[PDB]
Amino acid sequence: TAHLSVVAEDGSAVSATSTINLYFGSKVRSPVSGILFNNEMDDFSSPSITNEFGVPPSPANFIQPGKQPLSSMCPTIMVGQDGQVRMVVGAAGGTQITTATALAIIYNLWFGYDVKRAVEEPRLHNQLLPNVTTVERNIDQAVTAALETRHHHTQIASTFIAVVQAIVRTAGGWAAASDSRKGGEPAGY
Amino acid sequence: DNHVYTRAAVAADAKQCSKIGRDALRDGGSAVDAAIAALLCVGLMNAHSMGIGGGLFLTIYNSTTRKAEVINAREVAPRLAFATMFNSSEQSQKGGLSVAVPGEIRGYELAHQRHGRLPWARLFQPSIQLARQGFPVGKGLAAALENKRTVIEQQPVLCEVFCRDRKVLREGERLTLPQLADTYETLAIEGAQAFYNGSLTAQIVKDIQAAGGIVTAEDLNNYRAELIEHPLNISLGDAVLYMPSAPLSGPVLALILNILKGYNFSRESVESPEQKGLTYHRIVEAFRFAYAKRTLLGDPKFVDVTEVVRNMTSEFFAAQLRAQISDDTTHPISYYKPEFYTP
Ligand SMILES: *[C@@H]1O[C@H](CO)[C@@H](O)[C@H](O)[C@H]1NC(C)=O
Ligand SMILES: *[C@@H]1O[C@H](CO)[C@@H](O)[C@H](O)[C@H]1NC(C)=O
Ligand SMILES: *[C@@H]1O[C@H](CO)[C@@H](O)[C@H](O)[C@H]1NC(C)=O
Ligand SMILES: *[C@@H]1O[C@H](CO)[C@@H](O)[C@H](O)[C@H]1NC(C)=O
Ligand SMILES: *[C@@H]1O[C@H](CO)[C@@H](O)[C@H](O)[C@H]1NC(C)=O
Ligand SMILES: *[C@@H]1O[C@H](CO)[C@@H](O)[C@H](O)[C@H]1NC(C)=O
Ligand SMILES: *C[C@](*)(O)CC[C@H](N)C(=O)O
Ligand SMILES: [Cl-]
Numbered sequence: 001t002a003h004l005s006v007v008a009e010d011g012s013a014v015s016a017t018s019t020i021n022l023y024f025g026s027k028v029r030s031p032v033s034g035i036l037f038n039n040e041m042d043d044f045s046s047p048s049i050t051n052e053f054g055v056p057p058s059p060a061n062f063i064q065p066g067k068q069p070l071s072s073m074c075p076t077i078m079v080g081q082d083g084q085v086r087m088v089v090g091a092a093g094g095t096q097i098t099t100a101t102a103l104a105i106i107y108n109l110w111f112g113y114d115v116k117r118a119v120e121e122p123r124l125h126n127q128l129l130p131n132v133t134t135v136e137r138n139i140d141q142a143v144t145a146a147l148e149t150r151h152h153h154t155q156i157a158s159t160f161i162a163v164v165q166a167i168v169r170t171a172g173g174w175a176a177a178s179d180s181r182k183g184g185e186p187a188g189y
Numbered sequence: 190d191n192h193v194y195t196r197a198a199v200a201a202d203a204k205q206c207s208k209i210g211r212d213a214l215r216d217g218g219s220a221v222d223a224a225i226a227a228l229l230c231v232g233l234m235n236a237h238s239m240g241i242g243g244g245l246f247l248t249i250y251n252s253t254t255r256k257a258e259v260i261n262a263r264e265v266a267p268r269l270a271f272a273t274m275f276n277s278s279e280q281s282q283k284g285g286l287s288v289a290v291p292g293e294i295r296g297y298e299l300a301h302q303r304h305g306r307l308p309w310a311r312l313f314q315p316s317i318q319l320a321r322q323g324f325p326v327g328k329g330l331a332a333a334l335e336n337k338r339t340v341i342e343q344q345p346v347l348c349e350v351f352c353r354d355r356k357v358l359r360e361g362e363r364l365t366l367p368q369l370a371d372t373y374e375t376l377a378i379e380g381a382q383a384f385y386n387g388s389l390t391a392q393i394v395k396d397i398q399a400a401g402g403i404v405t406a407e408d409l410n411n412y413r414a415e416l417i418e419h420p421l422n423i424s425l426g427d428a429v430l431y432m433p434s435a436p437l438s439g440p441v442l443a444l445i446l447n448i449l450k451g452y453n454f455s456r457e458s459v460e461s462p463e464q465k466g467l468t469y470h471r472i473v474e475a476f477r478f479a480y481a482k483r484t485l486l487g488d489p490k491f492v493d494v495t496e497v498v499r500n501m502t503s504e505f506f507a508a509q510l511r512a513q514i515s516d517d518t519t520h521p522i523s524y525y526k527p528e529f530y531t532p
């Protein structure tokens with residue numbers, strides 16, 4: 001997955017999330033056109049395949065010809081009561097996308113973190129199945145303690161949790177941020 | 190350098206692509222032209238994540254009409270697909286059989302027809318140059334190349350572009366994409382028809398089928414990007430949030446935020462370790478209640494999701510789940526009532 005956020009001079013906005021699913025998709029590249037093909041068929045649930053340990057198949061998400069598979073993606077635009085864009089945000093990174101998009105919103109809107117901080121801030125993830133809270137390597141360890149004493153089993157993510165690109169309206173203009181976990185950087189005028 | 194801009198901004202996961210977006214804006218592009226131009230670039234520099242072989246969704250807001258819309262250009266199962274077609278994870282993850290019908294280019298076209306200000310060819314120009322000239326491999330791509338080193342090095346058609354002297358490219362080394370540059374050139378001159386019903390089509394089908402796939406020319410000819418005039422929204426204080434409904438995860442996002450809004454989080458929620466730890470505990474619990482309902486979702490054209498979705502965006506429903514969050518403990522999976530079938 002990759003996410004990008006755009007705000008134009010007239011105040012219009014686009015939040016665009018795009019995907020070939022796993023890294024390098026299906027691993028099928030055309031020697032002629034160079035197109036690298038998705039393996040989005042794997043986003044469907046199958047009656048056969050063992051999903052994880054004790055995660056069953058979801059019948060709403062079974063393969064049917066012409067059907068689209070369920071996705072974690074959620075490119076979002078937040079607009080204020082006066083009609084001006086307040087936030088353009090979304091994430092990449094498989095099943096952590098929805099949780100990371102929620103966190104970036106929580107961090108900026110409620111905790112009052114500026115956009116760069118809200119993107120860079122350590123994240124955590126729990127999706128119910130599997131039954132584990134993953135936390136990022138540099139999370140506040142008081143938070144790890146607060147979770148463990150409330151009986152969460154946590155584990156640390158070997159790499160990182162998702163990638164977030166965001167733009168937020170400020171009195172100074174349009175503040176933008178790309179996630180250093182992937183190496184991006186914004187541009188504007 | 191501060192990345193606060195007076196007039197306009199592009200946030201992408203590669204500096205070069207944010208820049209290509211920005212120049213589109215400067216030359217008079219709409220936000221859509223800029224998104225398309227930048228996406229074409231990201232498909233080169235972050236080739237492991239996304240590209241013209243995949244699918245997309247755009248959420249678009251027009252500041253003048255004050256309307257939001259969604260473009261659905263996500264992949265679809267081929268016409269020859271069926272529920273029991275795979276018997277292992279490996280079958281669904283590798284080879285031509287795992288390939289769904291790509292929607293990306295039809296999505297760019299629809300978005301551009303409705304909202305474009307620059308010519309179609311102009312959106313491809315900087316990416317054609319970049320793919321032909323080459324670029325140093327970025328942080329994200331280098332880590333993906335490392336992760337999947339074994340598969341890349343054993344597959345000569347990927348090693349062709351993603352290796353140097355038979356080993357995966359590392360950060361800083363030069364990546365060139367000469368075939369894709371030519372494909373982009375064709376798309377720019379012949380339009381989207383070249384991919385779906387034109388000069389690239391038979392080669393697409395041949396490549397997918399040679400690797401064991403079942404996508405046909407008919408699949409491509411029939412693919413349609415979809416305009417959704419009324420995207421999901423929720424109210425949050427004095428703001429509204431627009432996002433895609435099913436088959437995407439806007440309803441999960443909506444449920445997480447509606448659960449949490451009744452706690453009235455502010456700066457004080459994270460000011461001391463005692464508040465901070467309770468606040469993050471509540472976040473995890475709302476994740477778990479919202480992921481419980483996720484398994485009922487699927488493509489709304491094939492699955493009746495309207496009541497599931499009405500619940501997940503209901504504030505009252507969210508207050509019901511909030512009242513079941515214990516401050517002092519998390520719970521076993523069954524407590525959240527994950528559901529695989531409607532009552
Ligand atoms: C798996 O099994 C089903 C049912 O027996 C069959 O129709 C299908 O072709 C098989 N798929 C693969 C990839 O072997
Ligand atoms: C927004 O809508 C107005 C009025 O319908 C139209 O003139 C304009 O082209 C739209 N803006 C964008 C950026 O598409
Ligand atoms: C293009 O579309 C027509 C139907 O209008 C179809 O008969 C033809 O096979 C298509 N061409 C290619 C190259 O797929
Ligand atoms: C939000 O969605 C609801 C339900 O579809 C609809 O009634 C309302 O018009 C929407 N609100 C906005 C601000 O678009
Ligand atoms: C919607 O929520 C109500 C409880 O508020 C419940 O009775 C009903 O079963 C729910 N419907 C679905 C489809 O989940
Ligand atoms: C899941 O983790 C929670 C947190 O400790 C625990 O209560 C539970 O027993 C675990 N297993 C299941 C099946 O819910
Ligand atoms: C590359 C993206 O992170 C994959 C996202 C996944 N296919 C989905 O939820 O759509
Ligand atoms: Cl990204």
Ligand SMILES: [Cl-]
Nearest residue numbers: 034366368369
């Ligand atoms: Cl190439």
Ligand code: NA
Nearest residue numbers: 116176177192
């Ligand atoms: Na920044």
